[PDB]
Amino acid sequence: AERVAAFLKNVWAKEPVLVASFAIAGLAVILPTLSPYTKYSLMINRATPYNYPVPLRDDGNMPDVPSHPQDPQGPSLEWLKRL
Amino acid sequence: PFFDVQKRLGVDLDRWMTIQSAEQPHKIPSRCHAFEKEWIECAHGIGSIRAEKECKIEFEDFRECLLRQKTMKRLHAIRRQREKLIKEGKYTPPP
Amino acid sequence: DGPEKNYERTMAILQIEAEKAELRLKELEVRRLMRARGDGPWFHYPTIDKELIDHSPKATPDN
Amino acid sequence: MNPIIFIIILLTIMLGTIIVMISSHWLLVWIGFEMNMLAIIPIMMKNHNPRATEASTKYFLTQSTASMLLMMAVIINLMFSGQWTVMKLFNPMASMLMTMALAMKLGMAPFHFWVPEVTQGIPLSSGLILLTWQKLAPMSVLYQIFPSINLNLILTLSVLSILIGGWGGLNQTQLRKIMAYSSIAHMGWMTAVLPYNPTMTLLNLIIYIIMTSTMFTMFMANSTTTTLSLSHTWNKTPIMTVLILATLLSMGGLPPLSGFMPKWMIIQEMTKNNSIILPTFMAITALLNLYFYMRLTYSTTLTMFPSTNNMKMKWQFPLMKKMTFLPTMVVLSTMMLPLTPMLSVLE
Amino acid sequence: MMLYIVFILSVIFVMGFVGFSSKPSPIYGGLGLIVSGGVGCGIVLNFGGSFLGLMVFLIYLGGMMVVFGYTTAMATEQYPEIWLSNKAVLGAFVTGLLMEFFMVYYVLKDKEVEVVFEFNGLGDWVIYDTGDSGFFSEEAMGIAALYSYGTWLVIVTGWSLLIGVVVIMEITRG
Amino acid sequence: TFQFLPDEARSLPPPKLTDPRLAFVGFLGYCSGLIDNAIRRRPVLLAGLHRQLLYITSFVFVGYYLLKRQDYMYAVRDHDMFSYIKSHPEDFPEKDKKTYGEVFEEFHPVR
Amino acid sequence: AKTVLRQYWDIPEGTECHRKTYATTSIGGAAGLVVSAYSVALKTPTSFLEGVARTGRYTFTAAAIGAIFGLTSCISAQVREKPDDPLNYLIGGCAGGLILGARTRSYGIGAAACAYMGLTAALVKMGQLEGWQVFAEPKV
Amino acid sequence: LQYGPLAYILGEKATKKMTEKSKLITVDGNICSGKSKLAKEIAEKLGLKHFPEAGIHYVDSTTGDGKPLPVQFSGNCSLEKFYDDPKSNDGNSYRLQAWLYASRLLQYADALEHLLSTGQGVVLERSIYSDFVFLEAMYRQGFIRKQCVDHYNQVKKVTICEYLPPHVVVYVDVPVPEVQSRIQKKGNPHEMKITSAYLQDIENAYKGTFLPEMSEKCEVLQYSAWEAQDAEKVVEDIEYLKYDKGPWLDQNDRKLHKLRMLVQDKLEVLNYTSIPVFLPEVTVGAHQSDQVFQEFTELPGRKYRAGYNEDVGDKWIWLK
Amino acid sequence: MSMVYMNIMMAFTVSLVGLLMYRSHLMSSLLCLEGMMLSLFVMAALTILNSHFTLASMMPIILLVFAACEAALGLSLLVMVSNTYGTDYVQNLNLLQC
């Protein structure tokens, strides 16, 4: 550890540009896995409707599928509004 | 492939881009998606020797969608005939 | 070896060789038919796999 | 070259070939050839001399031209079938362009001129890769597109290579050029049988690679690149001359040696298809190769050529070259005929 | 007419190719390839290839062809020979130019032509797609998919570029 | 698909460890060991017996599996052929066999 | 090349000699042109005229052989009244071989060419009668 | 680990072992110039390894038990015969010179291998760079033919180009009259038959071709017979050198790895000393060479690779 | 086929004939090689765009990237040739005749 700190002080004195580069590059690799917000990036992208939502033929056995856009069933974006 | 490593491992290295009726971003279909699908389904599993003869109708339709040679030829015929009649003043086109 | 042993040993040799010769002729005939007709496990050249096809609703309806 | 870089470049040569062999998409096949060609140039150039630069440049121009023609065939195939699957092509013009492109890469006659010149101009180890490993990727494509190949074109390429390879080797005293023309002739056998039984193509390719590797390894052990240099082997490593003799007789197709097997099975497959004139013509024409293999055996093993006084200094030092796999390769190159039915593993 | 713009660009494309393919001084050959590259981008642009068209400008012209001219000025030609002063170049240039004109004359006269193969001459607009009302560029969606579907393409392509650096440093060290 | 020995090959009897072909493979491994000694100028018969043993073992080990695939591929060939013959009886009719008393053959004298 | 060979083999042997002599002369001329093209590309002539002289020399030499073979073999079949006979082609083949000796001004080449080309032509006739395949279609 | 790429990858790099004392020094001069004594003193004072001048039996000293072999195994080259009969029809003159160049080439490879593997410098007495002075002298006295010189230059062309030149060239300058005086005093019966003209040709080659050439790329120090007795002054001159020329400045771990791979493989070192050029002086008929080679294999400890000879006490052969 | 394919196919043929009929400069033959790539890029792009083969839209870029890397290698060989002889003339690359 002490040898690790002595090495870091040496590079900080002689090559601060490279030290900063490696530190930034290390944060870029690591921080997405530690961030609680990374999961919303997946959800927001999926929630963007690029193409038409084709309706399903009602067979009488789809209680979880809304009949009207304003009916309660179906995905909600309330989590996105509060974000 | 010479060595079918992809099927052995179940990994998809390049099959995803081999045909235009495969899955596409945002379900954007190719122009000849329905023709490719019909031809692929006709020819599936019977081998190319058989498919060359038995799926010829689907393949001929698919090739027509791809390059549109017959369609262009038919349009060429109608346009060529129309120019003849107009050159002879026997036809006036509607607005 | 007595003549009987050689005689009947010869028959066993002839039976094996005759059976192999018939199989050699049948294989040439089977291969000829499979290659011309394509209905056998041999000369089965691949066609595109239909499990690659996406069947979900598309961005536009006409397909 | 740095030893680690040399390893990574060798692995890239292999990776490019592997990509060609595992790909189902034509673009990935093209990429495999591009990556493979990029990584092989540095081992042609590694000895830095005008001859190695000329060879690398002649090689680059040939392979780049062939890869452009291949990409044309792929794009024409896409236009007329709307797909990239590696298989039969769907357009006869595309088939001719891909066949010609792959013939150029393999150095088949009449696209053969680069093979003797490039092999002569590069080190023995690089020539070993050029004449063995580099045949794998193009042959594996031919293995998959052969149903759509024009029969007359492929058999014409095969017949020309057997004639050009046989005649070209008669005039050679350089060992690398002898191997180059020998390679051209052997490619012709591989493609002549491909329309009838691709399995026999694989058998010929594998055995050819084994005997070719054996010969290059034995040349490398003694640093011999010319006939006269090879004629000094008897006065240094007498065992090596016997191994060279046995391997050359095998490459000549003499029974009871392993090199008889591919010619034997190709003749069988062609006769089953009522092809009699062609296999007979091929077998008789292959006697040209046997002639200049036999010439090498005369000057290496069956006679003792004049020596030099300084050779005595060599008697006091042992062989220190790796000679990797040589004992195994030489035994497979000569003693495999009794196991011929094992070819079915390649089915 | 502007309805034949793609065809007109393709004609100019060929003339530029006859330009450098007859192989004048590499300085002029490089110029002919640059003009063909720009015209080639224009053809791609008119088929909806906005991003692809601009890559020819950015990479083919602004990258590869810049390096070609840089190398030519440094290791090939420093002063161009007068254009078409050589007989073979002039003959090859004239021969190709006449072939293109005869092709273009007949296709425009008959609205078709058979130069080895059969080509329609009604105008490339006829094959275009008649329905498009999406809220995105399809070309952009396909190219963006390199990072989701094309993991294997990225790996081999990225590896080859790294080996390109390594190999070129080996070649030139001498 | 891309399998050296598919699972269906296990219904076949294994090659015997005393197979004459396997013995020949072992002999080839022995010969390689001697040629290794010879090219490196060691005593051909005695030098490095540990190395000579691995040459034989390696050849036999690889040879055994190659023989297994060989036999399985020929079993598959026969299986395919017989199934196809059953599926297409019209192409392989049972031949009407006459005796030599009924069959006419020309006589060609040697005089 | 398939169109000329179709014309030649369509005519019955020993009849319509002039048509037969034209097909073989044109076939011989094509081979001469092919040889000239490779010869000029791989062995540059000193001048443009030297390249033209060589092309004509090879091309006429090859058409001379093709003409004599066709004419001689068609007359032999007519005179002998033996259409389906390989011996007519042997006679026609040797005649072409002698021309090569004359055009190459040599007696050994003419004798060697007569025997080798004479046998080759006879073999070609036998294969036509018996349906021998050089490039056989894959069947099994 | 025997040296190779694996050893190099794991950190066996030349620049580690080599210091400012890792120098290759060569001492040159005419016959009887006192170079042998000066070379030993330089090596002793600087702590370098001394290589006695490579003679006809140098290769024997590095192989087997190290003792010289009979004369038929060196081709019957004889320096004594060269003085007695320099124009002998048996071609002994050039056969000796060709053999001596190969011996020097082998020694130079040994010296570089020692320098690159241990980091300790070496002192040589003459080298492959100065060997040509004897050949030029031989040719000018009419002892060898022009075709012999052409053969010599071919072998030198494809061998010397692989190696680096010495860091320091030390030349001891004794005039010919003094050399002849020292030759007669030494009292070797064969050497006294040397002609001053032969000695003058050796000096002309040294000063005409050798020293000017090596000056372009080496540190060339010249001393007279008197100045060469003061070894300390010679060593003082060496230690104060700048080393601002030559290709040793361009070297690096990569290039020195390739060089060490070459010099350690002696068969690769001697590869081109036997080029198939059928010069009568060095060509050996098949029957003689075959007979001599069989005799060589019968010598103690020579039938098999070193370590596999039971006749000289090697053990565990069945596990080696 | 559509009218554009005529000229794009012609352009490839022109550059192929240019590549196969060398003059003197090696650079001139490299330009024809890159002309071939350009015509391939345009033809592939046109086919892919017109057919609306979405995922294939990346293929011309991959072709461009790899072909540029190949051209970089070719340029490196040209400069090494030029360093040896002082020109990029292909008539100097005839040592391996023998």
Ligand SMILES: CCCCCCCCCCCCO[C@@H]1O[C@H](CO)[C@@H](O[C@H]2O[C@H](CO)[C@@H](O)[C@H](O)[C@H]2O)[C@H](O)[C@H]1O
């Ligand atoms: C020589 C280099 C050695 C290194 C080898 C590294 C190989 C890496 C292979 C990467 C591909 C792995 O396998 C593949 O991965 C991606 C996700 O990662 C998956 O792909 C996934 O995302 C995209 C987006 O739709 C689609 O391809 C598909 O819908 C989905 O499956 C594939 O279904 C899977 O088959």
Ligand SMILES: CCCCCCCCCCCCO[C@@H]1O[C@H](CO)[C@@H](O[C@H]2O[C@H](CO)[C@@H](O)[C@H](O)[C@H]2O)[C@H](O)[C@H]1O
């Ligand atoms: C030293 C010897 C060198 C090698 C010699 C090789 C000899 C090979 C024999 C020549 C090939 C056989 O000859 C070939 O046979 C077939 C069999 O119908 C003929 O085939 C022909 O059939 C009919 C006529 O019956 C024609 O309408 C048709 O055009 C054509 O296909 C060929 O027209 C003929 O050229």
Ligand SMILES: CCCCCCCCCCCCO[C@@H]1O[C@H](CO)[C@@H](O[C@H]2O[C@H](CO)[C@@H](O)[C@H](O)[C@H]2O)[C@H](O)[C@H]1O
């Ligand atoms: C070596 C030359 C290198 C430069 C290559 C230049 C590009 C070549 C472009 C080839 C594309 C055209 O390819 C060609 O198109 C026509 C158009 O129907 C096809 O069709 C043609 O032949 C088939 C025959 O059954 C039929 O469709 C029809 O008789 C005819 O139209 C050809 O089968 C195909 O071979």
Ligand SMILES: Nc1nc2c(ncn2[C@@H]2O[C@H](COP(=O)(O)OP(=O)(O)OP(=O)(O)O)[C@@H](O)[C@H]2O)c(=O)[nH]1
């Ligand atoms: N022909 C020939 N003789 C050589 C060669 N090298 C040495 N000799 C001879 O070997 C003998 C000894 O050489 P020297 O070292 O110079 O004489 P030295 O007196 O023992 O040693 P120094 O006192 O240093 O001069 C001389 O007769 C040399 O001529 C050579 O390369 N060729």
Ligand SMILES: N=C(N)NC(=N)NCCc1ccc(I)c(Cl)c1
């Ligand atoms: N294309 C060809 N003519 N050859 C070919 N492979 N035919 C397939 C017939 C066959 C032959 C041997 C075996 I074992 C198996 Cl399993 C199958």
Ligand SMILES: [Mg+2]
């Ligand atoms: Mg001394």
